[PDB]
Design a protein around this ligand. Structure first.
Ligand SMILES: Cc1ccc2cc(CC3CCN(C(=O)c4c5ccccc5cc5ccccc45)CC3)ccc2n1
Ligand SMILES: Cc1ccc2cc(CC3CCN(C(=O)c4c5ccccc5cc5ccccc45)CC3)ccc2n1
Lengths: 681, 681
């Protein structure tokens, strides 16, 4: 392409053109997408702020003579292996002074992005690099799976021991090498290339090959071993640092498993995540069952799956999303969650309010709702809601958000009925698309799964506190759902709660309720150390619902005894229904001590903003303590800390406690160093 | 029932009769079933051994004035709460000197086995009792879920504020109490029983009740709180001690969740595990959708589910199974796995051997097979195979077994095709039973799940080492299975491997193979600290299978170039197929260092018996070390230990290393105490 204003990048690095022909960004151009996505991130926070190019740095990482990773600046396309990495340091709204993370990616142009042992070694080496530093690990997947090959240096010289030269089709006994062959190999030091047993049959001296090894590396099982190496490496990383994967072109085999093992994944439309490919599958079934791999791993499969948390119209789009998702995550493992305050101050009422007699979208209660008569603010900061797993198990709504600047994970219940439409199985002539009516406020195996999954992804890497707008009638107990292991997924929820390490708020919203089974798996005693529960004054909760309570304790007979208040069943059965309901009031909860406080939705944002803030500070102090005595329970540590508050402080006053702490960090610190004489030997 | 030889137990304790009428054993008679099951356990080990009744002790546990559990001996039916517990100490074949465990159960006769807060408190108190001691916790579930009730002491005296006395059916404004009522309550100190706002309307002085609390405890949310308390308690216990649950009569709500949270569960035929019951569900759908709860939680639901690991023809049957399952579990958390040697010595060849050209039942390779020409021993001790999760995901076979006395978890691949038959959904007129062909040697979402589940249940509580007779072609990658999250369940496998704390052997059996994706999730590098892999000389393994390798690297053209060895495609394509295969040989694995050794099936039992034994001893030594320095990696600890072996010992000789260690425990011990001067201050 002659005469262009500036140099042709696809010509200086012809590999950049191949990448493009393959429908993906060339690996070396990715740090540029991040610098761009970072800049946008700034435009959106303060249109005014002036950015210098020194707000973003990218250094490629490569192994040195010792195999240790070091930074280098070399021309794109110099990579000798099919795996590349960059360490990135960027100043962002949440970390204006700078934050770092790593990017690892397949070079789709280097042997079609196949994973040979050397790639696996590099990928595992980069992952530990990140784990050790606690910084996030971003994997950009565009690969062909594990590398394969045969001992090509044996195909031209192998000889077959026919049954009779005359008619080959009669079969053969084995394969061998002539002295001539065994000789050729030795002239290239390639004797290890094969295992042969020497036995001479009448005519010539034949060497029967019993096993082909090949001089070339990356042919089989060694590629499989390296594969498992990184699968395990990723499994580990997910519990250690922030892990996220962008699929920019097909991702195969170990590639597909790496996407899931990292958990958090953003799939670019059209790029499939697959195990065995369509051609091969068809080839097996000897039929024309599938057309493209997208039928097997496109977004209509993985995004509906929960495997893919988000989709992206194109690469840059996915990057921006990663960059956005990261904006809620601590700079590095164990650092405080990044506070980011915006125009939507904490001090205000919650506008949008649900009504028992009219359907709403829980997202309104979360991020507010745009109205013709203006905008009604929701419970969280305007425009801070970052929903994830939106294509799967739509009974629940999960995402990140900000509460007066404080980032946290949010889980809400979708009250509207879901029309889950499952497409027919091509490999089965019978199969026909089925519609699944997933009724609102009811946990189903998939929505139970998503909830547990959400909590875990909030806890690992993200290390965020979380709020749950609990509002479920219960778990679906009919045959189909029960048969589909709904109990297993329900229990996953409890398990994730037991494992949670940050503050948790369980809050039953206004027209909401929490019944029997549902209340079980989310009750604060599941993890007293971090859980706290609140009920809105207009919520309801009890083992059963009025209809049920009467169906058991206010039967057909008892109703008559009260008919001694002077046919008329209709209005009396209604009286009993209302008699029960007076039992499920938040007031009773407070009385039975199963909730910390009853609240008023409109005033919620103010309460939670200071409750959360107070909590984060006390947690910070409990941790500082722990890194010393090494022997004391939470109940004792939190007590030693609260004994430091000025006598005049109301331990129950969140804002006050928080304020005194933030005004005395350095003073509280001195007291801790003063506790060094705590060396019990 | 007059004139019987001995006293009528159902009359002395009429509650025992109720229990029976309810189709279950009376709670107090359960320790007797255990003493019986224990005795059988002895008969089956040594028909000769004489047992005195002092080989089994059962002491009921109850809370004292401080709420602490203590042992008592009182008459059955004295329990003031609906929950009972017994501590059991029994001498058994594996622990002839005695072993202990706890039993907790619902009293189906005490308020229909409902969980009120007091029961929950007791159940949680018993669970910690066990966790602290590390002894197993056996839960016998027979319950009605969480307890419910209304403020009965308000139903006779509440008054309704009609719109007009004349016609009630016109509706009412609210409910209230007359001065007369408010007075009655005060004469019973039951004022807290209600929250009323006093406002007098023309006529009388009316107290409008805004919230009903009730003097009775165990009406609602307080029952829900206690429920979650134990769900979380069970969740925790499962990662701490050996947990197992027997369902002897329906198990509802929190009852159903406790069954799953404990994980290991044995369901007695006919007793359902359910959430909301059929009546209520029907009542909701306002239709006659379900007949019995067994449609919702019978064995045809939970056993096919994987929720129920085993079923039992009746109570005693379930007990025997628990008792048997426990025979492989350590006496208490962290004690050595119980060795139990029987007539089937370790020193022998493996008889039964699979053949590439004839279907077999992997169970034969495991526990041997009975033939007309005699019995052919399998890889493990004759009759020591205890299969579990047999009704679900039949693609894999999992169970416990013994190898020359050493107990371990076993996972085998079912080569036969499974005819998974799913029954139609009653709640759906369309629904019709579907047949699912699950082809052998292929992981499917359910068989992937079972495998991960097996590994985890082998690791937690059981604390057993494990062997995997790896032999899968790969994961099902077609649409249906891919769409059904097969990747999620596959990754669970890796996760469980990362978490494994005991020795692991991955062994590809004789006519077996391990291809691409399959090899990935089970490769030893996933957990080098505990994993070891072996390939039989007649197994195969590679990224692809020959058919595939040629379809890629030995195409239609290349085949012709080799046609230069003098239509005849058939036999040449066969040559290439065989050319590839010479690549997937165990010999190559050894060469590429991806396996520890290649083995001969018939000689396997001898090898593994000493490899496992050697390993258990070295592990024991690595642990002893750890409880000191507190700073040294495995690679360094195992090295300090092996530096103690006599110069003349072949570190690679399992039997020798094991023998020198068992002959020097006390001497090795002295050396460790000598390392006390390792107090780095
Ligand atoms: C297919 C399916 C299966 C189970 C489902 C369960 C629920 C939530 C449940 C519904 C049942 N429930 C009740 O309080 C309830 C009832 C609730 C609404 C109408 C009638 C009811 C009758 C009952 C009779 C006896 C005991 C309880 C009853 C508690 C909360 C919601 C949707 C469900 N969908
Ligand atoms: C519904 C379904 C979907 C996917 C499945 C996958 C397997 C195991 C796979 C089968 C595919 N495979 C092969 O080595 C293979 C082949 C294996 C057997 C016959 C033909 C093959 C053609 C291939 C062409 C290109 C690449 C690989 C091929 C590796 C192991 C087994 C059963 C499966 N069932």
């Amino acid at each position: 392409p002659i005469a262009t204003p500036y140099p042709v990048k696809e010509w200086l690095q012809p590999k950049r053109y191949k990448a493009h022909l393959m429908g993906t960004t060339y690996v070396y151009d990715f740090p540029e997408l991040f610098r761009q996505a970072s800049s946008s991130q700034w435009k959106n926070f303060s249109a005014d702020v002036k950015l210098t190019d020194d707000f973003f740095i990218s250094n490629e990482l490569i192994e040195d003579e010792n195999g240790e990773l070091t930074e280098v600046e070399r021309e794109p396309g110099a990579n000798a292996i099919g795996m590349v990495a960059f360490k990135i340091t960027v100043k962002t709204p949440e970390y204006p002074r700078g934050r770092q993370f790593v990017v690892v990616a397949n070079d789709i142009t280097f042997k079609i992005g196949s994973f040979g042992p050397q790639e696996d070694e590099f990928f595992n080496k980069v992952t530990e690099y990140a784990r050790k530093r606690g910084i996030p690990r971003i994997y950009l997947a565009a690969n062909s799976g594990a590398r394969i090959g045969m001992a090509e240096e044996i195909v031209p010289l192998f000889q077959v021991a026919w049954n009779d030269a005359a008619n080959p089709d009669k079969g053969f006994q084995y394969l061998y090498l002539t002295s001539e062959g065994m000789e050729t190999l030795k002239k290239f030091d390639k004797e290890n290339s094969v295992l042969t047993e020497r036995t001479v049959i009448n005519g010539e001296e034949r060497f029967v090959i019993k096993t082909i090894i090949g001089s070339e590396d990356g042919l089989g099982v060694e590629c499989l071993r390296g594969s498992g190496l990184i699968a395990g490496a990723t499994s580990r990383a997910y519990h250690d640092i922030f892990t996220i994967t962008l699929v920019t072109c097909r991702s195969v085999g170990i590639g597909a498993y790496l996407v899931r093992l990292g958990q958090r994944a953003i799939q670019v439309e059209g790029q499939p995540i697959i195990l065995t490919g369509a051609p091969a599958i068809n080839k097996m079934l000897g039929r024309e069952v599938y057309t493209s791999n997208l039928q097997l791993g496109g977004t209509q499969i993985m995004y509906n799956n929960g495997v893919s948390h988000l989709t992206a119209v194109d690469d840059l789009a996915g990057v921006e999303k990663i960059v956005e998702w990261m904006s809620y995550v601590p700079a590095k493992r164990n650092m405080p969650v990044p506070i980011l305050e915006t125009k939507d101050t904490w001090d205000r009422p919650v506008d949008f309010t649900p009504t028992n007699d009219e359907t709403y979208d829980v997202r309104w209660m979360i991020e507010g709702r745009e109205t013709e008569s203006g905008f009604e603010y929701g419970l969280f900061d305007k425009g801070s809601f970052f929903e994830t797993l939106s294509g799967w198990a739509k009974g629940v709504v999960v995402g990140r958000a900000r509460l007066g600047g404080i980032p946290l994970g949010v889980i809400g219940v979708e009250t509207r009925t879901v029309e889950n439409l499952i497409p027919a199985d091509p490999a089965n002539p019978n199969s026909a698309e089925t519609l699944i009516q997933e009724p609102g406020q009811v946990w189903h195996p998939n929505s139970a799964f998503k909830t547990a999954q959400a909590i875990n992804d909030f806890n690992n890497g993200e290390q965020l506190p979380m709020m749950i707008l609990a509002n479920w009638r219960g778990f679906s107990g009919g045959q189909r759902d029960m048969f589909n292991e709904v109990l297993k997924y329900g229990s996953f929820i409890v398990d994730a709660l037991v494992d949670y390490k940050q503050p948790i708020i369980i809050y039953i919203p206004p027209t909401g309720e929490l019944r029997g089974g549902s209340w079980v798996v989310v009750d604060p005693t599941i993890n007293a150390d971090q859980m706290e529960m609140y009920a809105d004054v207009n919520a309801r909760a009890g083992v059963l619902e009025p209809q049920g309570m009467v169906g058991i304790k206010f039967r057909r007979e008892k109703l008559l005894d009260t008919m001694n208040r002077l046919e008329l069943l209709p209005i009396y059965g209604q009286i009993s229904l209302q008699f029960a309901d007076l039992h499920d009031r938040s007031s009773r909860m407070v009385a039975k001590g199963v909730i910390s406080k009853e609240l008023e939705w409109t005033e919620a944002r103010r309460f939670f903003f200071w409750r959360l803030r107070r909590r984060l500070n006390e947690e910070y102090l409990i941790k500082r303590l722990s890194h010393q005595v090494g022997e004391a329970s939470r109940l004792e540590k939190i007590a030693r800390i609260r004994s430091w508050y000025p006598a005049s402080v109301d331990h129950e006053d969140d804002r006050q406690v928080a304020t005194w702490i933030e005004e005395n960090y350095k003073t509280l610190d001195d007291k801790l160093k003063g506790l060094k004489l705590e060396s019990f030997a």
